[PDB]
Structure 1
Amino acid sequence: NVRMMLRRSMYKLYSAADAEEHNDVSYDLSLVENFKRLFGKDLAMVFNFKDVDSINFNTLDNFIILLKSAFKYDHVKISLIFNINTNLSNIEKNLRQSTIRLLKRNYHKLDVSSNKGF
């Protein structure tokens, strides 16, 4: 579901950014936007959906809709990476185009394999 992996991400971020500089805050999307007034430094996130294809797509859509709600603080950047295995056109219409409209804004494409160009 959505909340579980949200808590995973929040726990990762907190336990990673705490020890690096040396109270407790719950696991939620308020923490990321409250990062400035807790640690003093801005933050940039990178996301890696490991197996992009074998996950529940409605849950994925709910998760991405929830994450697009934190672009109103002017002090944070993030980036998403899909590690695709089949193709872009294969699944870009499997998910609702509501998410796909904004994903056409700024993308990048790589030909990826162990035998790249011999």
Structure 2
Amino acid sequence: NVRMMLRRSMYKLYSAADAEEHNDVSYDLSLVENFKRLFGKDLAMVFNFKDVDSINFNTLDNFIILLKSAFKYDHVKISLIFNINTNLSNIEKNLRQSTIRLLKRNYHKLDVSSNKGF
């Protein structure tokens, strides 16, 4: 589902950025936009959808629509990667183009294998 993987994200983030600087906040999207006024520092995230293919694209769509709800605080950046196994045109029309428009904006592309170029 959506909510669980969100809780995973926030648990990772807070238990990561706490001990590096030495009270509790719940696990929600408020916390990220509330990062400034607990620890003082700004933050930059990076997202790795590990096995990008074998997952509920609906839940995915829900999630990424949730995640676009935090580009209004002028103090944060993030980035996503898809670690793909098949192909873009296989799945860039499997998911709703609502998601895909902005995903036309600023992307990057690699050929990726064990045997690169002999």
RMSD across aligned positions (CA): 0.2
Cα distance, 1:17 vs structure 2: 0.1
Alpha-carbon distance in structure 2 between the residues aligned to 1:60 and 1:109: 21
Gaps of 5+ in 2: none
Report the TM-score, using the length of structure 2 for normalisation: 1.00
Cα distance, 1:32 vs structure 2: 0.2
Cα distance, 1:72 vs structure 2: 0.2
Identity of aligned residues (%): 100
Alpha-carbon distance in structure 1 between the residues aligned to 2:112 and 2:27: 35
* 2:51 aligned residue: 51
How far does the alpha carbon of each residue in 1:36-73 deviate from its partner, in whole angstroms, 9 at most, with x for none? 00000000000000000000000000000000000000
Give the paired residue count: 118
Alpha-carbon distance in structure 1 between the residues aligned to 2:87 and 2:116: 17
How far does the alpha carbon of each residue in 1:9-29 deviate from its partner, in whole angstroms, 9 at most, with x for none? 000000000000000000000
Task: Determine whether 1:98 maps to 2:98.
Answer: yes
Alpha-carbon distance in structure 2 between the residues aligned to 1:40 and 1:3: 27
Alpha-carbon distance in structure 1 between the residues aligned to 2:47 and 2:11: 14
Gaps of 5+ in 1: none
SS at match of 1:89: coil
